Design a binder for this molecule. Structure first.
Ligand SMILES: [Cl-]
Ligand SMILES: [Cl-]
Lengths: 111, 109
């Protein structure tokens, strides 16, 4: 019942893509804020996304390789080792009962 | 300059009040939340305000003593020793690229 992130695949080949799937999204949504690391921290913000206007805006940690989906799921393309680690989603609601979840993935080289 | 919190006064007498001033707010804002502590943590949200709405909303840490001004400043009445410590403002921009700043105050008997 709780907001959760699941990476697919959990172990990712360099040069390939990972999808951070988002489950149990709440109602009353204004939009989404994604971060590298285990907490909400503006210095590590990848991207912000407003549902009503469909506008995505890069944060300080934006790489240009990300795609955000309407249900908050986040894809990262052309993966490098440095991408490995934790990713945190903050869901901003009109009632400010904002929800947070964290997921992770690992990276491996190929050939 | 950078978003900064200024406690007024920094050293607060038990039973008196404190006002946390907010300097250098960015333009184009959705709203704000105040937290007890040094991070954004939903369990420690005191109060929040969505710009343009008729009311402020209490979080789990609300104690009936706090008001948040439209410019994000936090006023707390009837201070007790347990109020001492860090307070973190989460500024929610209209583009959802958000920012935080942390301030602090001390309480004396
Ligand atoms: Cl990490
Ligand atoms: Cl504290």
């Amino acid at each position: 019942a709780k907001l959760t992130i699941e990476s697919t695949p959990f172990n990712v080949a360099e040069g390939k893509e990972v999808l951070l799937l988002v489950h149990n999204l709440p109602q009353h949504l204004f939009g989404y804020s994604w971060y590298k690391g285990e907490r909400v921290d503006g210095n590590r913000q990848i991207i912000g996304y407003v549902i009503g206007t469909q506008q995505a805006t890069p944060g300080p940690a934006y790489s240009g390789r990300e795609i955000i989906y309407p249900n908050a799921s986040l894809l990262i393309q052309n993966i490098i080792q440095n991408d490995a680690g934790f990713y945190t989603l903050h869901v901003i609601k009109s009632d400010l009962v904002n929800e947070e979840a964290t997921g992770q993935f690992r990276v491996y080289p190929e050939l």
